[PDB]
């Protein structure tokens, strides 16, 4: 992924190195678009926001009163 960002501003490359992920069966790095490992956009946008919003709710607690 670092390589895919290095060429990004120039669009000069032999390979994009982009969208390479974890092959959890063979234990290697593969091109996920061809391999077929896809998730819908909404899953990643919602997951990142959902995790943050809960984190903020907890980080905002600097006091607990226990009656």
């Amino acid at each position: 992924h670092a390589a895919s960002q290095m060429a990004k501003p120039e669009d000069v490359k032999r390979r994009s190195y982009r969208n390479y992920g974890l092959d959890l069966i063979r234990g290697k790095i593969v091109d996920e678009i061809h391999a077929g490992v896809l998730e819908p956009t909404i899953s990643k946008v919602k997951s990142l926001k959902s995790a943050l919003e809960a984190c903020v709710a907890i980080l905002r607690i600097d006091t607990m009163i226990t009656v």
Binding site: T63, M64, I65
Partner: protein
């Protein structure tokens, strides 16, 4: 050296008083400001809540200490008079108590401390008045801007362009120009699910939470109506004592059934003889407000019925409409009826809301109702919550005209002013005034801390900037620094700051005067 021994040690009580009260104030302190921190509270019933509302925190804090609980009454008085600043007045009280503790350690008698603090408080009030930017309650734009600004911290801020002028008209209906003290308890907020936020009305009459007749044939709407308040229940006789009836034939049971029906009808007919068009029946848990059968009979009489009306709603009806409570059935008479041009139930996405409008009578009184609509509970709740704050902000502008910049601006200015004015004082008063001025800094200090800013840096920048500015320099969480309080629209009504100075001083006075506690049973 050596000094008075004081074998009896009332100072142990005064120490416990300040220690307990400051602990409460330091706790709530962390919630000050739009960037303040939330608290978790587990209540005695096992329910756990998260909130940054100052009053809710203190209410559920379950304070036991006989003196620290005074800070709850302080937040109540602040909410009662100003409606805002319920956190700030408690924080200031804590800081002034800390100043008192240092003064006590220096050998200053608590009588001296209380009297000197009161004198400094009187100067703080004058300084606040000097800093005021005057407004008129005849200028709706000044009031709308003040309300919308305070609502910027709410979940839905966009509709304040409509909710704010509704609050203004609601107050002005009861706050005619030649007035000072405005009682917002004459403005009733009635909400139902359905519709959207824009679908909100300011009504010159009384709006109820209850529905009209459910039974077939009911008119559900009356024109040119006389309106009575029923406090008795229209239900078949059901004695609470012992009764023994023997029934050997159906004819006897039919007579019993006729008694139940005739009783309900006899009341319905006696009511109609009073020329009453609408029956607004007070809720009771003893018997049903109106039996289904009574609604049938009353419907046939072309009488509109609204059942199970809350006690508070009855108090609004008896003030607005000219109608009077009717304790009993035989006492139901024309003299007890009010006036309205139209009484109707409005069904807006199932709102089923009853409105009494158009009193058109000398018995009319300046009562206000608001009709709140919205698809979800959160919509009508946020609308109600926003209007409650908007009404309080506007009330403040009527009682003590003008706004003062927020962000700690008056706290820096007052502290600087008193620090210099103290130079004209002599003796214990000069030293105590300096401690008072220092205590004021707890607010801009806390705001800087909760905003993520360096405490000393922010307070220092404000103190130096107030060499040239007066109210224009304060803390902006939006800009995350010391910036122009007016361009950022950081404004607080005079009454809120004035009340915080007064009530905090009164609390410290009350706390320092406590030298003992005894049981009485």
């Amino acid at each position: 050296n050596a000094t008075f021994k004081n074998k009896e040690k009332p100072q142990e009580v005064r120490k416990a008083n300040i220690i307990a009260a400051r602990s409460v104030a330091d706790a709530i302190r962390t919630s000050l400001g739009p960037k303040g921190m939330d608290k978790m509270i587990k209540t005695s019933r096992g329910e756990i809540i998260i909130s940054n509302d100052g009053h809710t925190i203190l209410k559920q804090m379950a304070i036991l200490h006989p003196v620290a609980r005074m800070l709850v009454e302080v937040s109540a008085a602040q909410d009662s008079e100003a409606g805002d600043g319920t956190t700030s007045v408690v924080i200031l009280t804590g800081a002034l108590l800390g100043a008192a503790e240092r003064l006590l350690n220096k050998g200053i008698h608590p009588t001296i401390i209380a009297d000197s603090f009161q004198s400094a408080a009187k100067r703080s009030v004058d300084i606040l008045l000097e800093m005021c930017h005057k407004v008129s309650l005849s200028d709706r734009e000044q009031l709308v801007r003040a309300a919308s600004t305070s609502l910027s911290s709410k979940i839905v801020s966009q509709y304040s362009s409509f909710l704010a002028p509704l609050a203004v008209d609601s107050v002005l209906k009861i706050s005619d120009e030649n007035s000072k003290n405005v009682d917002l308890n004459d403005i009733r907020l009635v909400k139902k699910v359905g519709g959207t936020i824009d679908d909100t009305e300011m009504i010159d009459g009384v709006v109820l939470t209850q529905t009209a007749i459910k039974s077939a044939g009911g008119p559900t709407r009356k024109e040119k109506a006389k309106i009575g308040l029923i406090q008795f229940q229209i239900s078949p006789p059901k004695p609470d004592t012992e009764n023994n009836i023997i029934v050997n034939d159906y004819r006897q049971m039919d007579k019993i059934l006729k008694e139940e029906r005739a009783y309900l009808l006899n009341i319905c007919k006696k009511i109609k003889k009073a020329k009453c068009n609408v029956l607004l029946i007070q809720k009771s848990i003893l018997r049903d407000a109106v039996n289904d059968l009574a609604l049938h009979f009353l419907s046939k009489l072309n009488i509109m019925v609204v059942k199970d009306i809350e006690r508070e709603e009855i108090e609004f009806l008896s003030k607005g409409l000219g109608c009077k409570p009717i304790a009993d059935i035989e006492l139901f008479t024309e003299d007890r009826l009010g006036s309205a041009d139209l009484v109707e139930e409005i069904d807006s996405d199932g709102s089923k809301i009853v409105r009494v409008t158009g009193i058109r009578n000398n018995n009319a009184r300046p009562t206000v109702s608001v009709v709140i609509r919205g698809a979800n509970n959160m919509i009508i709740d946020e609308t109600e919550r926003s209007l409650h704050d908007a009404l309080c902000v506007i009330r403040c502008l009527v009682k003590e005209r003008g706004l003062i910049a927020g962000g700690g601006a008056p706290e820096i200015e007052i502290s600087r002013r008193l620090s210099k004015e103290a130079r004209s004082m002599e003796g214990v008063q000069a030293f105590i005034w300096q401690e008072f001025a220092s205590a004021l800094e707890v607010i801009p200090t806390t705001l800087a801390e909760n905003a993520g800013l360096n405490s000393i840096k922010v307070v220092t920048e404000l103190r130096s900037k107030h060499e040239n500015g007066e109210l224009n320099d304060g803390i902006s969480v939006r800009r995350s620094g010391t910036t122009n309080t007016y361009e950022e629209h950081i404004l607080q009504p005079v009454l809120v700051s004035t009340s915080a100075i007064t009530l905090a001083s009164e609390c410290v006075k009350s706390i320092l005067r406590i030298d003992d506690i005894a049981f009485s049973r």
